[PDB]
Amino acid sequence: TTHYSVADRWGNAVSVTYTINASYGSAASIDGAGFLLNNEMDDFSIKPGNPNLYGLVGGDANAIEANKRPLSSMSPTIVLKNNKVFLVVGSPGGSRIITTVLQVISNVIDYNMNISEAVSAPRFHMQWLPDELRIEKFGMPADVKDNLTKMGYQIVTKPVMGDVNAIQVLPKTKGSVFYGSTDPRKEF
Amino acid sequence: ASYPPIKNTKVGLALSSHPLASEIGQKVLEEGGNAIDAAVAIGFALAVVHPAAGNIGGGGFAVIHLANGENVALDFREKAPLKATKNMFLDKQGNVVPKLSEDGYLAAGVPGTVAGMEAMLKKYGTKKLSQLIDPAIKLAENGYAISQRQAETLKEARERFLKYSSSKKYFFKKGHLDYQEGDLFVQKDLAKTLNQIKTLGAKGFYQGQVAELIEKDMKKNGGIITKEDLASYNVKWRKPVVGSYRGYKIISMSPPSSGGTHLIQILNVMENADLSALGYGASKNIHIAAEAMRQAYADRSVYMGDADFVSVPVDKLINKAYAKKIFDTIQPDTVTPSSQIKPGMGQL
Ligand SMILES: N[C@H](C(=O)O)[C@@H]1CC=NO1
């Protein structure tokens, strides 16, 4: 997956997440046409309770039917302040998308981070199954780990999560200022 | 400490994960295009310069806020083909066939990206498709240098590519040699396809010669997508899922994504706490978020799918009273193990 974010001078904003699912999709190209096919069928529940590429499970609601669209986790998002564009945000990461995008938004609104800080900030993740609190390297110091472990979390350090491209828009006297951030995780 | 944000005070920003695509989008803004024009240019550019993820063979979503205050969501998600069936990836014993949903032609839904790009351009853009797709065509025809990271991801996919005669043509050099960092990567057949789109619009992908190539290769390699699938592919303009968090409006993707619903659900739970008081990285704050996530993902496993086929209780999941009920179960000193979680808390 990959996410991109656009905001123009007039107040339009477009947040696009799109994908062929896995890296290089199904790995099969259409001969003569030069493009890779998606493996988006794996986003269906192919058997009740069977975990997919992201450890997500399902049953009837996300079962396969002809013409049906497989359930996604993609969360292209726009946040408004007084009905005006404030944030344009999104990310790849399958099951991790929802939690990555949540954290960036919270980092701005709750903690008053600038958009670069909000994106670079270490991320955690809980997706119920597996029953683990996933963290990033150097992302959680001993004191915090110990207190969360004492609560009952099984903390696991795994590869970095997400690749957020985000825009924050703020008013000025004449027009607006646009602040952007790519994600340091992009090349990991 | 973090590097400073990118700043623009004139035409806005167009940001993607590939600098060549970002530059293309930014130039569209510099040349007087709107956010949709730039988004369309980026969608096609990434299909060339970021083939691990950027694509014309997949699909996705666009959430759009218009200058007139309207918020809309574009669904260009892939569709299961007409010949798809519930148990298509299972063997006679009802067990999953290894890799059948992952590698090759049966793993594919009907692509939506080209239809999505055209749909947003037609409804909300101001520039011509030819202007917006030309940069992508130029990069396909003339090539670009493989980055270190692309060399790495190509290597990781190498054995998958080698399963398919088509991919052996496109993702290896002469003599079936690996592409390496700094090699010029040229995509002549992709340029042909993009040129069909330039000349005929989306019909250049979903009908005619390209549709013929798709059906042919599908028939040859055990896939099921046909010209009928392609001619019947439809984007859908949907209402976004909308919520509020501390005086801000959250606009995100509705079914067939679960993302917007659970994003708003988890924020709703979190809204019951003054997170700012303890600040970033506090264990109390992480705990509240993580318990909200735990419930949301349990709910996802039962309630979420394509609402055109199944009933999806979006309004119940984003209800602030439900979020309050979730919040009130969160204890200061302990978690609720996933084994004890009930979708909807057993009361949805
Ligand atoms: N196939 C997944 C989904 O649709 O949720 C994508 C792959 C990248 N991000 O998420």
Q: Is A19 annotated as a binding residue?
A: yes
Resolution in A: 1.5
Residue A73 CA, ligand 1 centroid: distance in Å: 6
Assess whether B210 and B268 both reside in one domain: no
Test site for ligand 1: of A4, A15, A16, A21, most ligand atoms within 8 A of the Cβ:
A21
Closest Cα of chain B to A159: distance in Å? 15
A25, two tokens: 């999709």
Residue B200, burial from CB neighbour count under 10 angstroms (0-12, 13-18, 19+): middle
Beta-ladder partners of B75: B61, B236
Residue A38 is classified by DSSP as P
First-to-final CA distance of chain B: 43
Q: Which long-range contacts (CB under 8 A, 24 or more apart) does B309-313 make?
A: B309/A65, B309/A68, B310/A60, B310/A61, B312/A61, B312/B255, B312/B261, B313/B348
d(CA B249, CA B73): 15
Nearest CA-CA partner of B229 in B87, B108, B338, B68: B108
Question: Which of residues B239, B263, B286 is at a domain's end?
Answer: B239
Among B12, B216, B263, the residue with its CB nearest the CB of A7 is: B12
Assess whether B198 and B333 both reside in one domain: no
The answer to whether B87 and B178 are in contact (CB under 8 A) is no
The answer to whether A41 and B106 are in contact (CB under 8 A) is yes
Assess whether B203 and B126 both reside in one domain: yes
Closest CA to ligand 1's atom 1: A21
Assess whether B267 and B194 both reside in one domain: no
Question: Which of residues B207, B222, B239 is at a domain's end?
Answer: B239
Assess whether B282 and B221 both reside in one domain: no
d(CA A183, CA A186): 6
Residue A53 is classified by DSSP as T
d(CA B83, CA B328): 47
**CATH number of B249's domain:** 1.10.246.130
* Cis peptide, bond prior to residue A130, ω within 30 of zero: yes
Assess whether B192 and B93 both reside in one domain: yes
- Test A41 with B111 for CB contact under 8 angstroms: no
Give the number of A-B residue pairs with CB atoms closer than 8 Å: 522
Enclosing domain of residue B294: 240-348
Structural domain count of chain B: 2
How far is C-alpha A132 from the chain's CA centre? 18
d(CA B24, CA B235): 25
Which residue ranges have their beta carbon within 6 Å of ligand 1?
A: A 1, 19, 21, 43, 72-74, 92-94, 97
Closest Cα of chain A to B321: distance in Å? 20
- Test A12 with B53 for CB contact under 8 angstroms: no
- Test B64 with A15 for CB contact under 8 angstroms: yes
B165, two tokens: 């005669």
B79, two tokens: 């569709």
- Test B294 with A76 for CB contact under 8 angstroms: no
The answer to whether A180 and A166 are in contact (CB under 8 A) is yes
Query: Is A1 in the active site?
Result: yes
Q: With the CA atoms of A188, B61, B224 and B301 taken in that order, what torsion angle do they form, in degrees rounded to the nearest 10?
A: 80
Chain breaks of chain B after residues with C–N above 2.5 Å: none
- Test A70 with B333 for CB contact under 8 angstroms: no
Question: Which of residues B210, B239, B268 is at a domain's end?
Answer: B239
| Way it was determined | X-ray
Q: What are the residue boundaries of the structural domains of chain A, listed by start?
A: 1-188
Q: Residue B316: list chain A partners with CB under 8 A.
A: none
SS3 assignment, position A80: strand
Assess whether B36 and B182 both reside in one domain: yes
Q: Residue A115: list chain B partners with CB under 8 A.
A: 5
d(CA B72, CA B119): 12
Assess whether B213 and B305 both reside in one domain: no
Atom of ligand 1 nearest to the CA of A94: 10
B329, two tokens: 């179960």
* Cis peptide, bond prior to residue B256, ω within 30 of zero: yes
